[PDB]
Amino acid sequence: VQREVLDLGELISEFEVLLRRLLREDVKLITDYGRDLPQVRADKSQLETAVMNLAVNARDAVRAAKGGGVVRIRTARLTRDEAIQLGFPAADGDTAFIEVSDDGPGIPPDVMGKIFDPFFTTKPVGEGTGLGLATVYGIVKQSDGWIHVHSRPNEGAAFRIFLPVYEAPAALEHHHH
Numbered sequence: 001v002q003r004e005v006l007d008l009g010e011l012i013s014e015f016e017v018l019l020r021r022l023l024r025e026d027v028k029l030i031t032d033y034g035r036d037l038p039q040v041r042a043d044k045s046q047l048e049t050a051v052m053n054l055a056v057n058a059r060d061a062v063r064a065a066k067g068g069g070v071v072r073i074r075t076a077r078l079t080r081d082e083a084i085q086l087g088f089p090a091a092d093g094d095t096a097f098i099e100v101s102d103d104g105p106g107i108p109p110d111v112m113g114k115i116f117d118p119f120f121t122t123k124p125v126g127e128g129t130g131l132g133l134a135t136v137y138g139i140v141k142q143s144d145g146w147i148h149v150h151s152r153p154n155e156g157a158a159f160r161i162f163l164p165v166y167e168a169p170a171a172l173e174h175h176h177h
């Protein structure tokens with residue numbers, strides 16, 4: 001683990017260019033960068049891997065649209081209340097937000113509980129490993145984060161990563177043990 005202080009906007013915008021090459025015109029990839037984006041502390045290559053795994057899943061999900069499916073990567077500073085509303089119950093203040101959303105078929109309710117399981121997949125035996133989301137989940141937890149999935153059939157799928165805001169001005173947390 002090589003944690004560093006990262007600007008959330010720079011992280012996604014720089015990576016977006018590389019991601020667009022990976023996706024080609026399989027999807028229309030859109031963005032929505034919020035204003036006054038926070039810094040976070042994380043391993044950069046791990047967050048990139050997590051976003052990449054989500055983005056390729058979104059592409060897979062909207063393949064049947066043959067060029068018309070839409071995948072959005074959204075970033076924001078959320079208020080505590082917005083974060084709770086978007087599915088982070090333990091939000092305690094301003095929160096960093098990364099969300100990969102698509103307009104695909106969504107996740108069947110009977111599948112939802114097992115999507116993060118190592119090796120769970122709906123693809124045939126020769127394609128992939130079924131670790132994409134297990135890796136994402138692990139990365140989010142290693143980054144002291146929370147992930148929430150919002151999806152119903154006919155509602156697309158949104159994978160929402162909530163990370164602590166890092167503030168360089170914050171006083172050192174400390175205690176007398």
Ligand SMILES: Nc1nc2c(ncn2[C@@H]2O[C@@H]3COP(=O)(O)O[C@H]4[C@@H](O)[C@H](n5cnc6c(=O)[nH]c(N)nc65)O[C@@H]4COP(=O)(O)O[C@H]3[C@H]2O)c(=O)[nH]1
Pocket residue numbers: 140145146147148149
């Ligand atoms: N030794 C070892 N311990 C492990 C491992 N994976 C998890 N744990 C520990 O197992 C506890 C229970 O995990 P859970 O059943 O997923 O139960 C979780 C899960 O239901 C939920 N949860 C935690 N983080 C997230 C998240 O980011 N998104 C969602 N949707 N649920 C979450 O909150 C519950 C409590 O989470 P924690 O307080 O982190 O408590 C975790 C953690 O202390 C492992 O590989 N090795």
Ligand SMILES: Nc1ncnc2c1ncn2[C@@H]1O[C@H](COP(=O)(O)OP(=O)(O)NP(=O)(O)O)[C@@H](O)[C@H]1O
Pocket residue numbers: 053057058060061102104105106107115120121122123127128129130131132133134157
């Ligand atoms: N955006 C999405 N929309 C609908 N279903 C999804 C989405 N993302 C993940 N899933 C489901 O969750 C499963 C697990 O995803 P994942 O863990 O990435 O494995 P995988 O994509 O099947 N193979 P791989 O990522 O190559 O290892 C997928 O096979 C889908 O059934």
Ligand SMILES: [Mg+2]
Pocket residue numbers: 053056057128132133
């Ligand atoms: Mg995958």
